[PDB]
Amino acid sequence: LIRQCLRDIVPVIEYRNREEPARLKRSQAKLRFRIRQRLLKFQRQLAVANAIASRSVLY
Amino acid sequence: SKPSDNVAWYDKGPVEWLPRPVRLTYDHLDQLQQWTMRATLDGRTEEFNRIRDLHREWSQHPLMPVLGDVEPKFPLNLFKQNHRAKKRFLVRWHKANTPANWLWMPRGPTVVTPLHRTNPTQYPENWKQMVQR
Amino acid sequence: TVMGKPLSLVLDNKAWLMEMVLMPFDEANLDYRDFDAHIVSEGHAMPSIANEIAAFALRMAVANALVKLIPLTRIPLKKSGLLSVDRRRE
Amino acid sequence: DKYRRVPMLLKPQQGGQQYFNHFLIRSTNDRLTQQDVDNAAVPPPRVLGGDYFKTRFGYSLVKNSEMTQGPVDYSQLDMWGEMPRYTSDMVFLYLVSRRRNTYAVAYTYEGKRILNTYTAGNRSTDNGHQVTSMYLNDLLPKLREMRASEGRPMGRGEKVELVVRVMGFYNGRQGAVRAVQDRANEFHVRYFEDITPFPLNGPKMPRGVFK
Amino acid sequence: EERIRELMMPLEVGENSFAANGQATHGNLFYFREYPMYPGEYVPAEHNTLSSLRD
Amino acid sequence: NTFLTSSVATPPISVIRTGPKWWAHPERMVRQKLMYFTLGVDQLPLRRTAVIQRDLQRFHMCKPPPRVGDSTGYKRSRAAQLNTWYRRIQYQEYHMQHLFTRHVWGLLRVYPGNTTKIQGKADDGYVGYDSVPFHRYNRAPLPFPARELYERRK
Amino acid sequence: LEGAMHKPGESGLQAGSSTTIAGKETWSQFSTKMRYGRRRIRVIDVAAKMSYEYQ
Amino acid sequence: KKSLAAMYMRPPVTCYTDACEAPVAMWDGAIPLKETRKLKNGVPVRTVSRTYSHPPQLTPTQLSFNDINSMYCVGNDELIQFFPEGLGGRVFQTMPPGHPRGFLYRKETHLLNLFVDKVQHWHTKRSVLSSLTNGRTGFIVDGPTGCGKSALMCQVVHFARSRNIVTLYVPDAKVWTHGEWCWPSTILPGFFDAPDAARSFLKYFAVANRATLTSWKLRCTPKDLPTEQGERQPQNLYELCEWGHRAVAPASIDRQSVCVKFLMDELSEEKKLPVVIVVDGWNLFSHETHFRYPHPDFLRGLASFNESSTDIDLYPQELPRIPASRLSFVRGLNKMILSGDDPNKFFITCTTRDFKPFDGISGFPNVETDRFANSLDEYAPYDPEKDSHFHPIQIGNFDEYEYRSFLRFLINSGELAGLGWGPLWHASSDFERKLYKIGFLSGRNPQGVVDHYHQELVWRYDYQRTRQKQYLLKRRMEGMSRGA
Amino acid sequence: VSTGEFDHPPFQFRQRHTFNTTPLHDANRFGGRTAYLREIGPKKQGRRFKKDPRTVQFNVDVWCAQQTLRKRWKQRDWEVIEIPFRLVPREQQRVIPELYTDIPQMTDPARNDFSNIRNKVYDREELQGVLFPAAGAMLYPPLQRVDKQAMTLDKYL
Amino acid sequence: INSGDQSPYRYVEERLYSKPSRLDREGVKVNKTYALQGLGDLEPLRYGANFGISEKDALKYETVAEKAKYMEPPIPYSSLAARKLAAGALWPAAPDPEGMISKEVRLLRHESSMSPSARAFSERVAYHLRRSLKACPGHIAEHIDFTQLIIQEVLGSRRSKEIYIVWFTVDPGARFELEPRLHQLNHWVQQLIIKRVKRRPHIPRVTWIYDGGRLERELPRDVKQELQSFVADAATTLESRVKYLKELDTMNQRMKDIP
Amino acid sequence: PPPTLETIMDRAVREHHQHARILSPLEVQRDVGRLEPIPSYAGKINADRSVFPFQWKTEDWYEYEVAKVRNRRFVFENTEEDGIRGSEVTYKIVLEGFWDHH
RNA sequence: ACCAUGAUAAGGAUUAUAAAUUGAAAGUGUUAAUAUCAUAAUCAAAAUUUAUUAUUUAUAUUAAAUAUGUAUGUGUAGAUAAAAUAAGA
Numbered sequence A: 001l002i003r004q005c006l007r008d009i010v011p012v013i014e015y016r017n018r019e020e021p022a023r024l025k026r027s028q029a030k031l032r033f034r035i036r037q038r039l040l041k042f043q044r045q046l047a048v049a050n051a052i053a054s055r056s057v058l059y
Numbered sequence B: 001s002k003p004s005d006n007v008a009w010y011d012k013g014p015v016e017w018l019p020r021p022v023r024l025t026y027d028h029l030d031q032l033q034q035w036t037m038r039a040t041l042d043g044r045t046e047e048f049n050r051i052r053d054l055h056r057e058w059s060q061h062p063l064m065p066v067l068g069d070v071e072p073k074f075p076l077n078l079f080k081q082n083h084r085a086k087k088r089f090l091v092r093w094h095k096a097n098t099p100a101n102w103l104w105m106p107r108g109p110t111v112v113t114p115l116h117r118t119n120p121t122q123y124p125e126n127w128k129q130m131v132q133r
Numbered sequence C: 001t002v003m004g005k006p007l008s009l010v011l012d013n014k015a016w017l018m019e020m021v022l023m024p025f026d027e028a029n030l031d032y033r034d035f036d037a038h039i040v041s042e043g044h045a046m047p048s049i050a051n052e053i054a055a056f057a058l059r060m061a062v063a064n065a066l067v068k069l070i071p072l073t074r075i076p077l078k079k080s081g082l083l084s085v086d087r088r089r090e
Numbered sequence D: 001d002k003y004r005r006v007p008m009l010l011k012p013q014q015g016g017q018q019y020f021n022h023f024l025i026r027s028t029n030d031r032l033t034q035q036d037v038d039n040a041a042v043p044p045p046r047v048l049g050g051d052y053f054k055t056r057f058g059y060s061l062v063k064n065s066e067m068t069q070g071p072v073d074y075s076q077l078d079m080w081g082e083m084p085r086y087t088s089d090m091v092f093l094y095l096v097s098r099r100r101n102t103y104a105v106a107y108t109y110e111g112k113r114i115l116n117t118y119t120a121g122n123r124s125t126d127n128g129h130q131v132t133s134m135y136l137n138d139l140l141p142k143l144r145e146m147r148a149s150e151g152r153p154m155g156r157g158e159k160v161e162l163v164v165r166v167m168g169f170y171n172g173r174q175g176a177v178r179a180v181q182d183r184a185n186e187f188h189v190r191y192f193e194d195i196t197p198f199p200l201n202g203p204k205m206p207r208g209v210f211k
Numbered sequence E: 001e002e003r004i005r006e007l008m009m010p011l012e013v014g015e016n017s018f019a020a021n022g023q024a025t026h027g028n029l030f031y032f033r034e035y036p037m038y039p040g041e042y043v044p045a046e047h048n049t050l051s052s053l054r055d
Numbered sequence F: 001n002t003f004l005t006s007s008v009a010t011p012p013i014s015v016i017r018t019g020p021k022w023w024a025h026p027e028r029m030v031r032q033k034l035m036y037f038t039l040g041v042d043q044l045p046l047r048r049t050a051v052i053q054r055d056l057q058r059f060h061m062c063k064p065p066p067r068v069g070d071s072t073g074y075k076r077s078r079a080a081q082l083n084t085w086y087r088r089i090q091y092q093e094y095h096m097q098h099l100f101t102r103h104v105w106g107l108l109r110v111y112p113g114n115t116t117k118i119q120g121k122a123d124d125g126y127v128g129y130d131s132v133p134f135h136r137y138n139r140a141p142l143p144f145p146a147r148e149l150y151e152r153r154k
Numbered sequence G: 001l002e003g004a005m006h007k008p009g010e011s012g013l014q015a016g017s018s019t020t021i022a023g024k025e026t027w028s029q030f031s032t033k034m035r036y037g038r039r040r041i042r043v044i045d046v047a048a049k050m051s052y053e054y055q
Numbered sequence H: 001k002k003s004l005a006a007m008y009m010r011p012p013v014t015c016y017t018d019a020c021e022a023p024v025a026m027w028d029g030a031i032p033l034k035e036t037r038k039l040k041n042g043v044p045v046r047t048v049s050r051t052y053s054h055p056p057q058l059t060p061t062q063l064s065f066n067d068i069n070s071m072y073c074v075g076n077d078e079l080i081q082f083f084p085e086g087l088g089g090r091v092f093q094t095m096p097p098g099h100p101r102g103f104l105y106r107k108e109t110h111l112l113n114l115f116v117d118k119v120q121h122w123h124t125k126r127s128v129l130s131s132l133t134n135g136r137t138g139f140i141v142d143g144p145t146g147c148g149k150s151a152l153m154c155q156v157v158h159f160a161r162s163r164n165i166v167t168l169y170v171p172d173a174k175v176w177t178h179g180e181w182c183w184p185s186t187i188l189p190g191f192f193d194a195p196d197a198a199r200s201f202l203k204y205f206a207v208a209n210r211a212t213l214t215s216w217k218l219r220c221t222p223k224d225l226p227t228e229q230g231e232r233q234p235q236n237l238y239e240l241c242e243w244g245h246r247a248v249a250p251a252s253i254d255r256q257s258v259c260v261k262f263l264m265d266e267l268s269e270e271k272k273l274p275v276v277i278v279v280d281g282w283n284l285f286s287h288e289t290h291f292r293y294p295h296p297d298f299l300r301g302l303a304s305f306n307e308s309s310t311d312i313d314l315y316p317q318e319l320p321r322i323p324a325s326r327l328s329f330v331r332g333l334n335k336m337i338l339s340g341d342d343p344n345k346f347f348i349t350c351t352t353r354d355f356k357p358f359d360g361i362s363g364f365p366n367v368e369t370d371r372f373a374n375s376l377d378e379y380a381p382y383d384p385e386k387d388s389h390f391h392p393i394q395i396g397n398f399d400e401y402e403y404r405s406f407l408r409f410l411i412n413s414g415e416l417a418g419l420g421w422g423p424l425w426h427a428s429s430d431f432e433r434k435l436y437k438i439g440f441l442s443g444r445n446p447q448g449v450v451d452h453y454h455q456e457l458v459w460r461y462d463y464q465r466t467r468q469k470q471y472l473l474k475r476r477m478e479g480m481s482r483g484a
Numbered sequence I: 001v002s003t004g005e006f007d008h009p010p011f012q013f014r015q016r017h018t019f020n021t022t023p024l025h026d027a028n029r030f031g032g033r034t035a036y037l038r039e040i041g042p043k044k045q046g047r048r049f050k051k052d053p054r055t056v057q058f059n060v061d062v063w064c065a066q067q068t069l070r071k072r073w074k075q076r077d078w079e080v081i082e083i084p085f086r087l088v089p090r091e092q093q094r095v096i097p098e099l100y101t102d103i104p105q106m107t108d109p110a111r112n113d114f115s116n117i118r119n120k121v122y123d124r125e126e127l128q129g130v131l132f133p134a135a136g137a138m139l140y141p142p143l144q145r146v147d148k149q150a151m152t153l154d155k156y157l
Numbered sequence J: 001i002n003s004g005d006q007s008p009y010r011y012v013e014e015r016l017y018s019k020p021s022r023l024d025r026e027g028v029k030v031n032k033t034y035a036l037q038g039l040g041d042l043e044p045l046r047y048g049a050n051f052g053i054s055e056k057d058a059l060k061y062e063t064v065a066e067k068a069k070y071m072e073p074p075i076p077y078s079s080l081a082a083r084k085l086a087a088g089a090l091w092p093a094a095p096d097p098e099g100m101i102s103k104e105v106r107l108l109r110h111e112s113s114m115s116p117s118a119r120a121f122s123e124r125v126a127y128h129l130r131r132s133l134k135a136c137p138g139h140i141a142e143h144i145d146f147t148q149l150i151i152q153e154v155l156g157s158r159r160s161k162e163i164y165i166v167w168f169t170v171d172p173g174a175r176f177e178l179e180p181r182l183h184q185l186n187h188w189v190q191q192l193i194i195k196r197v198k199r200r201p202h203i204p205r206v207t208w209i210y211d212g213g214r215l216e217r218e219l220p221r222d223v224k225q226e227l228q229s230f231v232a233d234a235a236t237t238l239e240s241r242v243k244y245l246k247e248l249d250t251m252n253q254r255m256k257d258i259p
Numbered sequence K: 001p002p003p004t005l006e007t008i009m010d011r012a013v014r015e016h017h018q019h020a021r022i023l024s025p026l027e028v029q030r031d032v033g034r035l036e037p038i039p040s041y042a043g044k045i046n047a048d049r050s051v052f053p054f055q056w057k058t059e060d061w062y063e064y065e066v067a068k069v070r071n072r073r074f075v076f077e078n079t080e081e082d083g084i085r086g087s088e089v090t091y092k093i094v095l096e097g098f099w100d101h102h
Numbered sequence L: 001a002c003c004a005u006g007a008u009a010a011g012g013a014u015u016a017u018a019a020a021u022u023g024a025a026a027g028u029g030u031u032a033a034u035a036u037c038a039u040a041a042u043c044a045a046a047a048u049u050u051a052u053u054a055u056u057u058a059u060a061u062u063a064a065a066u067a068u069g070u071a072u073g074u075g076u077a078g079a080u081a082a083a084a085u086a087a088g089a
């Protein structure tokens, strides 16, 4: 279980320390429908990567 | 004292399980030929019956099974790159599967076999007892 | 006879090595006693060639000799793969 | 490994080319023999008499009581004519299997309970096996005492005549009947049937069953 | 003794009869021909086709 | 026997996976028949071990065809049914060899290797002249000289 | 089965040959008491290694 | 499918070989069963019989000229009676206790069988026996390795002891010459003994000819032999040999040297009873035994090792090798051979070629894989005409007549006794393929026939049974398609 | 043709006593001669010669040459005696080249004797008049040669 | 056919029956040659040249109702249709009948792997199956020997689209007497689920699995997760998760860049 | 050796009792549909062990292979003889270059 | 010496309608991340050799201990001749 705890947070630590980059008419409606469907499916995956970039994670 | 998984307990059979590598030579076959030469000419047949009783017990045909399970009851696709964890599993999995725990060899005395003779009177060492009468 | 010594003494009386030498004769439906054969080793000299890789080349040498003697022997020998050369090294 | 350098004639190694010409001449011969042919479940065995039929089985067809009667009128048909014919000395063994329990009771021909119901709490597959095995271990002296009170010895050679009836469709149904099957020298089972409830109406069922 | 052995040949997988040919894994790896490989093999032609061309 | 050192045990599935190298080597398998033929017993698990591995080596260079897809698991489960049957036969002969050569070694008064059990003579692991001065698994000190399993005169 | 339980007489790296169940702990419980009981540090030899200011 | 096994009944057992039959579930497809119809109180009488039966167990008086290149057997009770010493070097490799004790009756076997028939009454046939041996004392049998040399020598004791003739049988001469340890003779100065070989020789020779040695009166034997309390002084030659070998250690070491010397003195004086002396491997008795002489510093006596002018503990050295003529057993044999006053002993012996191979170079033999582990370390050439006083008999390998009879006995009677393929007959080829193949692998050499019979298990490139099962399965599927 | 081992096994990680695996320096290999170069524990000049591949191969080449020598000397049932040219038999009255000088010479092809002169071995009982003329008592008996034309047991008479 | 780091079956399926493949057959100028070029009578009849369905005419309709309304009826017969008629390839051949034999599979799924609603639904199926197994249609009940029937457990999928009732017999030789008749009860089991069982996530397809006591269960969920956490190497999964976070951050930055 | 007693009996059975002589495997017309011109070496080659096959004692082979390499340059080139072998003086010019066509 | 090098990973396609041959195997295209010190004013790191109480990793030496309770790695290596608990949503 410790190795499971290691395999979760160490990809976040090595992200921040080592490799983090520098900072600073209906047919068109069906295209918007499929893109919103793609982002609603992977919303929980994308929310973490924005929160690591915005430094908002409760350890 | 460096404890390891190579203890090879001497409980579940005449041979210890996870057995030691043994090697036969032709010198062993020449001594066995000379031993059975002397045992036949002395009339000693009780040692031959102990060999035939061990042969009748452990050389039966294993049952041809029906479909449904495989010999790896545990799935061996979990150990992909951990090579030393896979061989340590195979030592322990074959340690629990003792020869008393085969369950496919008809070993017990409840089985019947038309291949081998069961009582030592059926062997030709005593042929004048049942010659013609 | 293989290099001046009989086949039972070259391959150390091993049946699974000497039966490959018989394999050009039985597939051809031929008796081995009607033929005399001598095999010369031209590769790496060793004190004992008692192995299945050397007996593979002993099979191919007899099978190519059977084709050159009788040409119709090539029809069952090629179907059994005795005239086929594999390319495997170490 | 990758055997791509091996020829295609070496991979199956199809030998035995000598025999093929032997087989076709073996075939074209035998068809001609078929032309020489062309141009030119099971019932059980028979019983002959009743005197050795009494020895072949454990009963006899000819009754030795010699019942002398004159009933000229038509005979009275039974209510359940197409049924197993239960004689008086037959014990009904009821095996009720459940998920966590298996029960074994033995009743007489008249409905008298021979032995109390054995439970796993009192004394799966091996659960029902051991429960009905320890029930049949105790059922033999109680049967001998309950038959010896009237005059039936049942001492030597006589097997206890049994009718097995099962309930449940569970795993304990497997090990129970097998633990009767090894008792063939003691318990002779004649009618192996099952007693399974037909749900005629049902009073009510709990909420977790429905929703 | 070969005439009796051909009638008791274990053609099916039984107790001591094991396939082991890869027939369960690969399936039908050994070829078998019913024709004579010309000109290595010979079976004489049947008399029905001979009488057909002769007539 | 002149192999008297301490040894390492192997699982039986790693022995049979060698195949023609050591487990079904033909020079080794023919002298295992001469042990059973001397004692006057059937070589029945040994021959059916050899008949299987004769045909197993015949097609072992062939590549299996790609399994394109089956709705039911029938020929996949049948091919694994025969494959687990061939291992259980070779598991029996692997036990039949180790049983009989230890029974022969109890007769010819030949001492086995270290930590090896012979059922007639030494039920525990017989250890003789080990690098470790005590018993490796029984935790008892070894005497000098080694333990005599048999009588004296030949 | 065999090896499913751990008796306290046998060591953890070796495997017990007994098939009994009473008086034995599971290997999830054996891993707990090995993580629990192994809290101590071996005593550092003071006189074996001189101090860095002395060196 | 066609079993015919439940309908098979067992024939009545008359001898030991008939009782060696396995249950019918073993050899049902190995030895197939045929049915014959007799006319016995009805026109059909279905009698299911075996195609192969065991070769007949015959006493040597029943063996004839028509049985040349045929197979016969001996009983197991006849085996323990006529052979208490044992058999040759490789003869017992084909006779486990389940197998019958078979023997091939060759044409050279027939010549020796009629020879002992004339030895049994030698005084009237003396000019016949002198012309057969060309005036020599006996025959020496020489040939290549693995032929019928020791297999013929065990037949001669079977021929002679069944005709109640006293026989000196040395089952293998490598117990005497290449023995465990050598000891000097107690009563013979300058001579040596093989004590462990002598006690086994004096034991089994007494049990073998007990019917004749009890009638053997001691002529030249001293009656003041040393005898402990409770033992009787020997008055017979059977009692003399039981005085020698039956004793406690170490008193048995010097008792055999007295017994063997007085046995050879008693046999050399008997001019009335024929004594056949059969030795397996006379070429070992014709040259040096593998023992060497001890270094003289062992018997001289030393006070210390540092000042004694010796290096016996420092460097080994090879002393001259002891010949076989200095052994007390071979001294009595060579006394009867060279001295012409014994027209009574017939030395039908042979040689052995059991030496290790050496073909120009030699590495070290692998300890696991070594067929020559118990072989002899001699490497010496041998000529039986120049190195022996006997008549040389040259036997070769088998011809195809007796090789067919020997291979039929090996394959069929091995599966009949429950020692062959049995239920796995369908994986091995038929007899004509095995006769063609083993004759190639062995060259009809008799040891090679037995060796490649065991190496028939590991044949890889036999495709007879594969193509036969393909043809029968093809013939089956078209037969049911014809019925459809 | 010889089936003995000639080369030494190579160096790898430390082998254990397993199936088809023997330790690298064992008492079974080469008759126990590897005890000179073995290590019991699982001085620089006395440790590195045990691990050099050319050094351990040369010692087995010596030991195999010792085994080749003792089997060639155990084959010798003869000895070389310098006999002068006049008392020598007719097949040795020729010019004999030395070893590896000419083609392997046949003895006398005119009398149909095609065999090497260097492997010719003469019996001692033939040359008693040459080797021992000073004794005059015939210390060795004459060799009894069997009559090939006499009817014996091998000729069915 | 060259695979190209794919399974060849799925690669030929994507090259034959996908939408860019048939649009490349009609002619669109797709990226690079999504359809197979040279096929004779092995070409599917949907994408023949003389057939009456053309996707270039169908691209101007935004709805399936407009395609059903405005499009012409398809051409019934063609030359490829004549070749498939002569070959008998208008309908596929019937496979081996899977209705009454078995459902042979290697493992059995654990109750920890499926959903808790799946466990509750399978418990309700087990209750109503063991309750009313005598209340079957009487023309099948007259042949079922109920003395040997054992229903040991019911397994299901995570959304109960299929149910697998696992069964065996006391005597195995009676199994073939109970095998086909039990497969005549699938509609009866479905009607029993519709009637007796409320809160059913789907009306399931019923499948009978013969067990015999032999078929082995799979490992539970937490033990499998701990095995994949304990055995698998940390470096490869570490760099793969770091690269996944790189791709997610790059997608976040590309979403932030577009105004 | 002479041929075996089984061989000369089985040939004389077919030669005399069956009226069909056993011919060599080089005399068998194996090609069906073609008549072969039956070459002259079918049964005329005598089987003698001195000529074929080649089996020798190994120590003569050990003597042969060492004597053949040690007598390599033991050759007298300028002999009083016939043509291309015989001469009075022998000149050998060994040309050496980096490429084989050079 | 602050040049614009070069290495890593990822996806594509073409051909086999033959039972012959020792041998049915070979050629051609796109995106992400990392990285970029040669037109100038010097010199002996390990250019480079050798030695002393001392710093290591290896080299072999190298032992007791049943009163209870007990002790699992990544890697380093040699030639390379077994294979289906995971969803082509």
Ligand SMILES: Nc1nc2c(ncn2[C@@H]2O[C@H](COP(=O)(O)OP(=O)(O)OP(=O)(O)O)[C@@H](O)[C@H]2O)c(=O)[nH]1
Pocket: H088, H089, H090, H091, H092, H093, H094, H102, H103, H104, H105, H106, H144, H145, H146, H147, H148, H149, H150, H151, H152, H351, H352, H353, H354, H355, H446, H447, H450
């Ligand atoms: N039963 C039987 N077996 C025979 C006969 N002849 C040869 N053999 C077999 O041939 C093998 C050779 O036997 P031996 O006579 O000991 O061989 P050898 O010639 O003495 O061999 P060396 O002692 O090395 O010289 C034996 O193992 C027998 O099995 C025979 O006449 N009868």
Ligand SMILES: [Mg+2]
Pocket: H088, H089, H090, H149, H150, H151, H280, H351, H352, H353
């Ligand atoms: Mg011998």
